[PDB]
């Protein structure tokens, strides 16, 4: 009978690919259906390019794709409309914001699978050691704490010790980190939901200059090549006071044999001042049935299973990834394992989106402009003032004649 083939997540990032393959194999065993897992590269933008090869070919060789929150507007032609397959009551079990994000010109492109938001990981043991009682609320405080803890840990002999790690590589992950910097300085959303390209302002420029000032000082020089896992590995080995990353890093840091198990907490990222908005970039992944799948019925069944209460529960408990079902945030087992899901729920609800709705199918070009200009500041090639002006000009060219 049919073989249902899935491309989603990556064995190169944490446990997500291994866990995805496991969930797909469980469905195949439960239903008596043959399945195959196709692995993907680590970085989202690399996955998009890979999957676009299949889509350009109208290839039947993948039935189900795990797609990024930033993609519906790009991938919609390649998605089977799921709306007719779900009742209104079934669809209401997901966060409406994400269902809306995944709905493009009426087509429900994909089911919400897990959500995501950028957060601050902090070493609680080190804060205590150096006399700090709370994680930093401002970027200035983050810098001051990192300098002091770094000075002390270096003097005690840890050559590998840094104050802060984050994603500074030129790829989509840096657009995520940079939105957070800019928004948390009161510099706006780069491109506003109304279409206004707002990034050429002094607050955005200051945000980028500040981030440059970390490189080689409180963050490793090599941070400009770090994606999620490079940051996580310095952190997880016990070599960074602070890290910006997503929820998945938490369960991995708590695993038996982690050097940092029991030594960290999480909180909202810091911001420029008390009246700036909190910034947590919205992430998350969705489950799409290919428009080119020969087996839409079986594929939809697998997608419903993956997005079900019990599979999302397993994702939350074992992988610390955020459900897209509000009911799971009150589940006793979810919360006992990850209490911070409750503490940070308002951070997740107020997460700031990248400009994927307003850029639509041009989002990947916009993001590439953003990450390359931001990177030029991190590498010291340009100051923030020049980079935001240049970025404005680039985005204006990219979105000229685009209406939303």
Ligand X SMILES: OC[C@H]1O[C@@](CO)(O[C@H]2O[C@H](CO)[C@@H](O)[C@H](O)[C@H]2O)[C@@H](O)[C@@H]1O
Can you give the binding site for ligand X, defined by CB under 6 A? 9-10, 13, 16, 44, 68-70, 116, 172-173, 176, 228, 246, 248, 283-285, 321
Chain-centroid distance of CA 341 in Å reads 16
Q: 250-260 b/e with 16+ CB inside 10 Å = b?
A: bbbbbeeebeb
- Smaller CB distance to ligand X: residue 42 or 218? 42
- Smaller CB distance to ligand X: residue 44 or 198? 44
Q: How far is CA 297 from CA 4, 167, 360, in A?
A: 11, 39, 28
**In whole angstroms, how close is the CB of 118 to ligand X at the nearest point?**
9
**In whole angstroms, how close is the CB of 340 to ligand X at the nearest point?**
15
- Smaller CB distance to ligand X: residue 240 or 364? 364
**Considering only CA atoms, which of 180, 380, 147, 394 is closest in space to residue 278?**
180
Taking the alpha carbons of 238, 376, 183, 394 in that order, is the dihedral positive or negative?
negative
**In whole angstroms, how close is the CB of 149 to ligand X at the nearest point?**
26
**In whole angstroms, how close is the CB of 24 to ligand X at the nearest point?**
14
Q: What SS3 state is found at 52?
A: helix
- Smaller CB distance to ligand X: residue 173 or 270? 173
Q: How far is CA 241 from CA 101, 130, 164, 238, in A?
A: 35, 11, 6, 8
**Maximum Cα interatomic distance, the chain, rounded to a whole number of Å:** 65
**In whole angstroms, how close is the CB of 281 to ligand X at the nearest point?**
8
**In whole angstroms, how close is the CB of 255 to ligand X at the nearest point?**
15
What is the Cα Rg of the chain in Å? 21
**In whole angstroms, how close is the CB of 200 to ligand X at the nearest point?**
24
Partners of 243 in the β-ladder? 121, 165
**In whole angstroms, how close is the CB of 70 to ligand X at the nearest point?**
6
Q: What SS3 state is found at 79?
A: strand
- Smaller CB distance to ligand X: residue 161 or 348? 348
Residue nearest to ligand X (CB): 283
**In whole angstroms, how close is the CB of 283 to ligand X at the nearest point?**
3
- Smaller CB distance to ligand X: residue 65 or 122? 65
* SS3 annotation, 89-153: HHHHCCCHHHHHHHEECCEECCEEEEEEECEEEEEHHHHHHCCCCCCCCEHHHHHHHHHHHHHHH
- Smaller CB distance to ligand X: residue 10 or 102? 10
What does the alpha-carbon distance between residue 188 and residue 206 come to, in Å, rounded to a whole number? 12
- Smaller CB distance to ligand X: residue 14 or 186? 14
What does the alpha-carbon distance between residue 45 and residue 228 come to, in Å, rounded to a whole number? 13
- Smaller CB distance to ligand X: residue 173 or 186? 173
Pairing of strands 107-108, 103-104: antiparallel
Note every long-range contact of 360-366, with CB atoms under 8 Å and residues 24 or more positions apart, other chains counting: 360/73, 360/74, 360/402, 360/404, 361/73, 361/74, 362/398, 362/399, 362/402, 363/70, 363/71, 363/73, 363/74, 364/45, 364/48, 364/74, 365/398, 366/191, 366/395, 366/398, 366/399
- Smaller CB distance to ligand X: residue 200 or 281? 281
- Smaller CB distance to ligand X: residue 186 or 283? 283
**In whole angstroms, how close is the CB of 181 to ligand X at the nearest point?**
15
Cβ pair 203, 185 in contact under 8 A: yes
**In whole angstroms, how close is the CB of 68 to ligand X at the nearest point?**
5
């Amino acid at each position: 009978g049919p073989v249902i083939r899935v491309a989603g997540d990556s064995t190169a990032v944490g446990e997500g690919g291994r866990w995805m393959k496991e969930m797909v194999e469980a469905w195949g065993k439960k239903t008596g259906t043959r399945v195959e897992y196709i692995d993907s590269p680590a970085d989202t933008n690399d996955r998009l390019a890979l999957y676009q090869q299949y889509w350009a070919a109208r290839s039947p060789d993948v039935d189900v794709y795990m797609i990024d929150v930033i993609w519906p507007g790009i991938v919609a032609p390649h998605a089977l409309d799921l709306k007719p397959y779900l009742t209104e009551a079934e669809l209401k079990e997901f966060f409406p914001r994400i269902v809306q994000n995944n709905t493009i010109r009426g087509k429900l492109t994909s089911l919400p699978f897990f959500t995501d938001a950028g957060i601050l990981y902090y070493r609680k043991d080190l804060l205590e050691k150096y006399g700090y009682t709370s994680p930093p609320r401002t970027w200035n405080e983050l810098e001051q704490m990192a300098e002091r803890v770094m000075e002390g840990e270096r003097r005690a002999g840890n050559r590998d010790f840094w104050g802060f790690v984050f994603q500074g590589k030129p790829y989509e992950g840096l657009t995520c980190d940079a939105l957070e910097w800019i928004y948390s300085h009161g510099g706006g959303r780069i491109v506003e939901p109304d279409g206004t390209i707002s990034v050429n302002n002094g607050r955005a420029a200051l945000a980028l200059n500040r981030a440059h000032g970390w490189v080689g000082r409180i963050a490793p020089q090599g941070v400009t090549s770090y994606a999620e896992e490079e940051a996580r590995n310095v952190w997880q080995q016990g070599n960074s006071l602070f890290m910006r990353n997503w929820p998945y890093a938490y369960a991995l840091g708590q695993a038996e044999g982690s050097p940092i198990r029991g030594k960290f907490g999480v909180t909202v990222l810091p911001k420029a001042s008390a009246d700036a908005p909190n910034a947590a970039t919205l992430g998350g992944w969705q489950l799409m049935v290919s428009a080119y799948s020969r087996y839409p019925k079986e594929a939809v069944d697998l997608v419903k299973y993956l997005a079900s209460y019990e599979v999302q529960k397993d994702n939350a408990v074992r992988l610390s990834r955020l459900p897209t079902r509000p009911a799971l945030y009150t589940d006793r087992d979810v919360l006992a394992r990850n209490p911070w899901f409750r503490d940070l729920l308002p951070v997740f609800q107020n997460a700031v989106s990248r400009p994927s709705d307003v850029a639509g199918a041009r989002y990947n070009q916009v993001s590439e402009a953003i990450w390359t200009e931001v990177h030029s500041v991190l590498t010291g090639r340009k100051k923030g003032e020049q980079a935001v002006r240049d970025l404005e000009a680039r985005i204006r060219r990219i979105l000229r004649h685009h209406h939303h």
